[PDB]
Amino acid sequence: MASMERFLSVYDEVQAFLLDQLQSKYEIDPNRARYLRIMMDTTCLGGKYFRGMTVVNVAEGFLAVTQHDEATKERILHDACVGGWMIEFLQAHYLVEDDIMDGSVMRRGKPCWYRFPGVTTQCAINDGIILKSWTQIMAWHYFADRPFLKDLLCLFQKVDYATAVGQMYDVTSMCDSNKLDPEVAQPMTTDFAEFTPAIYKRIVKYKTTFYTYLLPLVMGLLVSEAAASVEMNLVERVAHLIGEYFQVQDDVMDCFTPPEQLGKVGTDIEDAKCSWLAVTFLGKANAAQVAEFKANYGEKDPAKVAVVKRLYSKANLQADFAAYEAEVVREVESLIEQLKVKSPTFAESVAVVWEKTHKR
Amino acid sequence: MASMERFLSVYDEVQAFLLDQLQSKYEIDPNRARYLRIMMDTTCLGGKYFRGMTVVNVAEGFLAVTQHDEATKERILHDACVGGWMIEFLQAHYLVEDDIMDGSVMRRGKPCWYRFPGVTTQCAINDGIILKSWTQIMAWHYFADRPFLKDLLCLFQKVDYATAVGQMYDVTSMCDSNKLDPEVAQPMTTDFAEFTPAIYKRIVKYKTTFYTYLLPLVMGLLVSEAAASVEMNLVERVAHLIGEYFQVQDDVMDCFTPPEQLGKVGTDIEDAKCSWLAVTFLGKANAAQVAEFKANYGEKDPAKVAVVKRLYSKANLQADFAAYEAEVVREVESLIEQLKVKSPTFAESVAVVWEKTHKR
Ligand SMILES: NC(=O)c1ccc(NC(=O)[C@@H]2CCCO2)cc1
Ligand SMILES: NC(=O)c1ccc(NC(=O)[C@@H]2CCCO2)cc1
Ligand SMILES: NC(=O)c1ccc(NC(=O)[C@@H]2CCCO2)cc1
Ligand SMILES: NC(=O)c1ccc(NC(=O)[C@@H]2CCCO2)cc1
Ligand SMILES: [Zn+2]
Ligand SMILES: [Zn+2]
């Protein structure tokens, strides 16, 4: 039994639990059960499952070094799978709602869930709500008698909140802070003064890193009852750093990876996003180049999108990416070394996370 | 110190806690804090606060009969206020998202939050997410060391999920069940076969009654450590029944209360909602009347809305409302009598809830 095979098997089991519960306790009818099954599948499956499988991988590294009865090892792996699904369903929730919020068209060779003919925004907003409620139902059912229930729910809660805060930072990142005002329609910045490395960092740290790196790592510790094998400030530092590095590749790919090759036509430029490319370009451009950027950024007009795309090529942003990458490698290695002091095993799992981020 | 005065004072305190936490732990800037303060105010204030004040009222009925130190009485009232705010913020969350989902224009003498100029749907979806995350932050902070933390979070979780399920039942109530299919755009029913008292009941029970009646009642018990003063199956039965009766008045008002007098132009007819009026009309109409209903319902065309409005008047729906009301009075009195066996005090609080629903 490979890890992935176990993880996918547990999806069937959770799906059955949730659907059967809807029938026995929520008076659901079969057609609505079927609608929700389809919703779940469509939104929760696809890709590599780095997030969920990280929880499994962390727990398996502790299983290798820790004495347990076989039935305990099974229970720990089952808990890691359920906790990894809780993170995948949280990712579903985000994606569903973010797609609606941003007017996205495609995700994973498919219409964004809201664009399905028999879905609509009216239903999809609520479907995304359901996705996140399911995470809670899973935790309370599978982890009812577990000693880590409280800590897990508290952590999940804090990660979710960070993530929502991050979405707000992301969707407001093209406005001037001093002009945010519910009463006044928001103009795009003209100075780009808030396109800085520190503001960019704040966006990415909240929007992505808590749920993509910190949560899978700490959930793997909690289901292993191993949170005292580690210095949590180290776990936070390394998660946030790897997560930022991940998002700097994403930002670079939103612009430069061909559309079918990426699965979604990129719109960061036309959305005036505070991307790594824009911030880094503004960090090195001359006066005439800054003025040229201001004249073209944040416009749906493809010819102006192409101008921004050109200034990024003239500016040799690959040099800055390589230099950033080399610093993140130093720093991530340093963190891993510090994590070995208390736990070689957990340090190794972090090393695997990093390899999966970097080499990919 | 009146109860309402205490309840409103605690809003200031929670608001300060949440905003200060955003600054000290989430790197928020002042303008974004201000945006979120405004959001909170706009979405969480207004009206009578029946839901939040029910928690306070239930706890005050137990305080009257239970021996405690003064500092305990204060702590219990403070917990009841915080728990009542958790319910008001859950109501905020619903309203924000439901308004977006349904394309509503007005709420409480104001544009629906999403329609504010500097809000937009792109931000308001996430703002509604934040509203519900705040409920959790409040519980974990104010109730950290409380014996009822677990039970409260579990109850809140189950109520939230019921409510989301209910929204799905509501938004799909004009489709035929056998034709729900994410792949196929959903036609309005032509037979109206699912406009029955039992299907109507299922909608209202999930969509409204768990969060509006069951949650405030059980939260008042939990913060009072009094959940063994009561037979919970009775609390459920009475909550669901009063809640349904509430929603049958709402349904009647969506059609018949003038727009400024109601605060929002009603659209149940044009939305083809499974309302009490439609179900009850179909329950007594003759053949020609049913055919006339089918020809006019669920159309934005005001002249057809007026036809439906006319058939409802010809059909003397007030007779059915009075008869329904008289049965609910019997049944609610019966429940209250049964609740007195274990708790006169809690039975009285239920009697007040009922008076506030019925007489109003
Ligand atoms: N077409 C869609 O609306 C849609 C496609 C994919 C996702 N999610 C994912 O890609 C990751 C992988 C599993 C968890 O979320 C969500 C929605
Ligand atoms: N790094 C940045 O995000 C940033 C820094 C400076 C500028 N603009 C200028 O350097 C000139 C001087 C006045 C007008 O534009 C814009 C952005
Ligand atoms: N204009 C709006 O968008 C808006 C107005 C009112 C509400 N909420 C309420 O009326 C109840 C009362 C407090 C909790 O929810 C939400 C939004
Ligand atoms: N109570 C209902 O919701 C309901 C029951 C019956 C009908 N239609 C009919 O009675 C005739 C007989 C065949 C065509 O229409 C519609 C609705
Ligand atoms: Zn987005
Ligand atoms: Zn609605």
How far is the centre of ligand 3, averaged over its atoms, from the C-alpha of B154 (Å)? 25
| CB-CB contact of A218 with A236 (8 Å) | no
Q: Which residues pair with B188 in a beta bridge?
A: B175
- How far, rounded to the nearest angstrom, does the alpha carbon of residue B142 sit from its chain's CA centroid? 24
A·B CB contacts under 8 A: 163
**CA-CA distance, A177 to A190, in Å (whole number)?**
12
**CA-CA distance, B166 to B348, in Å (whole number)?**
29
* DSSP 3-state percent helix, strand, coil across chain A (nearest 5): 75, 0, 25
**CA-CA distance, A294 to B158, in Å (whole number)?**
50
Method: X-ray
Q: Which of A61, A1, A84, A81 is nearest to A351 (CA)?
A: A61
Nearest-Cα residue of chain A relative to residue B158: A137
Tokens 């880590």 — which residue? A148
| CB-CB contact of A201 with A244 (8 Å) | yes
The SS3 assignment for B233 reads helix
How far is the centre of ligand 4, averaged over its atoms, from the C-alpha of B282 (Å)? 7
- Rounded to the nearest 5 degrees, what angle is found at the Cα of A316, between the Cα atoms of A312 and A317? 65
Cα B95 to Cα A324, B42, B47: the distances in Å are 44, 11, 14
Q: Give the closest residue (by CA) to ligand 1 atom 1.
A: A112
Q: Which of B155, B144, B187 is nearest to B87 (CA)?
A: B155
> Any known ligand binding at B191?
no
CB atoms within 10 A of CB B73: 15
**φ, ψ (nearest 5 deg) of residue B106:** -125, 150
| CB-CB contact of B207 with B167 (8 Å) | yes
Q: Which residues pair with A188 in a beta bridge?
A: A175
For A114, half-sphere exposure in the C-beta direction (CA atoms, 13 angstrom radius) is 22
Nearest-Cα residue of chain B relative to residue A203: B27
Relative to the alpha carbon of A285, which ligand is closest? 2
Ligand 4 site residues, Cβ closer than 6 angstroms: B 191-193, 195-196, 282-283, 290
| CB-CB contact of B86 with B138 (8 Å) | yes
Locate the domains of chain A by residue range.
Answer: 1-360
Burial of A87 (0-12, 13-18, 19+ CB in 10 A): buried
Find chain B residues with C-beta within 8 A of A168's C-beta.
32, 36, 123, 126-127, 130
- Put simply, whether A165 touches B (Cβ < 8 Å) is yes
- Put simply, whether B329 touches A (Cβ < 8 Å) is no
**CA-CA distance, A1 to A88, in Å (whole number)?**
21
Eight-state DSSP code of residue A303: H
Cα B228 to Cα B57, B218, B232, B342: the distances in Å are 18, 11, 9, 9
Eight-state DSSP code of residue A187: P
**CA-CA distance, B24 to B12, in Å (whole number)?**
18
**CA-CA distance, A245 to A175, in Å (whole number)?**
24
Nearest-Cα residue of chain A relative to residue B25: A162
Tell me whether residues A102 and B121 touch, CB distance under 8 A: no
Which residues make Cβ contacts (< 8 Å) with residue A181, sequence separation at least 6?
B35, B118
Burial of B69 (0-12, 13-18, 19+ CB in 10 A): exposed
**CA-CA distance, A116 to B317, in Å (whole number)?**
39
Query: DSSP labels for A283-297?
Result: TT--HHHHHHHHHHT
Eight-state DSSP code of residue B228: G
Residues 290-309 of A with CB under 8 A from B: none
Is the alpha carbon torsion for B162, B167, B173, B176 positive or negative? negative
**CA-CA distance, A321 to A318, in Å (whole number)?**
5
Q: Is B207 left (phi over 0), alpha (psi -120 to 50) or beta?
A: alpha
**φ, ψ (nearest 5 deg) of residue A46:** 125, 140
CB atoms within 10 A of CB A19: 17
Torsion angle of C-alpha atoms B41, B46, B52, B53, degrees rounded to 10: 130
**CA-CA distance, A57 to A2, in Å (whole number)?**
11
Which residues make Cβ contacts (< 8 Å) with residue B19, sequence separation at least 6?
B33, B36, B37
**CA-CA distance, B239 to B200, in Å (whole number)?**
16
Residues 34-73 of B with CB under 8 A from A: 34-36, 38-39, 42
Among A120, A129, A178, the residue with its CB nearest the CB of B164 is: A129
- Put simply, whether B167 touches A (Cβ < 8 Å) is yes
Q: Tell me if A274 CB under 6 Å of ligand 2.
A: no
CB atoms within 10 A of CB A29: 18
Relative to the alpha carbon of B168, which ligand is closest? 6
| CB-CB contact of A80 with A63 (8 Å) | no
Relative to the alpha carbon of A274, which ligand is closest? 2
Query: DSSP labels for B283-341?
Result: TT--HHHHHHHHHHTT---HHHHHHHHHHHHHTTHHHHHHHHHHHHHHHHHHHHHHHHH
| CB-CB contact of A90 with A129 (8 Å) | no
How close is the nearest chain B Cα to the Cα of A291, in Å? Answer: 27
Tokens 């639990």 — which residue? A17
CB burial readout A151-171, b (16+ within 10 A) else e: bbbebbbbbbbbbbbbbbbbb
Secondary structure element (H or E) that encloses residue B222, with its range: helix B215-223
Q: Which of A315, A268, A298, A305 is nearest to A192 (CA)?
A: A298
CATH of domain A1-360: 1.10.600.10
Q: What is the 3-state secondary structure (H, E, C) of B79-136?
A: HHHHHHHHHHHHHHHHHHHHHHHHCCCECCCCECHHHCCCCHHHHHHHHHHHHHHHHH
**Strand locations in chain A (E):** none
**CA-CA distance, A137 to A89, in Å (whole number)?**
11
| CB-CB contact of B253 with B275 (8 Å) | no
| CB-CB contact of B83 with B57 (8 Å) | no
For A120, half-sphere exposure in the C-beta direction (CA atoms, 13 angstrom radius) is 16
CB atoms within 10 A of CB B302: 11
Gyration radius of chain B over CA positions? 22
The SS3 assignment for B53 reads helix
The SS3 assignment for A188 reads strand
Which ligand 4 atom sits closest to the C-alpha of B191? 16
Q: Which of B265, B277, B285, B359 is nearest to B318 (CA)?
A: B277
Nearest-Cα residue of chain B relative to residue A177: B31
- How far, rounded to the nearest angstrom, does the alpha carbon of residue B247 sit from its chain's CA centroid? 9
| CB-CB contact of B151 with B224 (8 Å) | no
Tokens 């915080």 — which residue? B82
Q: Is A290 left (phi over 0), alpha (psi -120 to 50) or beta?
A: alpha
- Put simply, whether A153 touches B (Cβ < 8 Å) is yes
Is the alpha carbon torsion for A299, A121, A207, B18 positive or negative? positive
Which residues make Cβ contacts (< 8 Å) with residue A323, sequence separation at least 6?
none
Q: Give the closest residue (by CA) to ligand 1 atom 12.
A: A46
A50-63 and A215-223 are packed helices; what angle lies between their axes, rounded to 10 degrees?
30
Q: Which residues pair with B175 in a beta bridge?
A: B188
B70-102 and B120-142 are packed helices; what angle lies between their axes, rounded to 10 degrees?
160
Tokens 């728990």 — which residue? B83
- Put simply, whether B125 touches A (Cβ < 8 Å) is yes
Query: DSSP labels for B25-51?
Result: HS---HHHHHHHHHHHHHHH--S--HH
Q: How far apart are the first and last CA of chain B?
A: 25
| CB-CB contact of A36 with A130 (8 Å) | yes
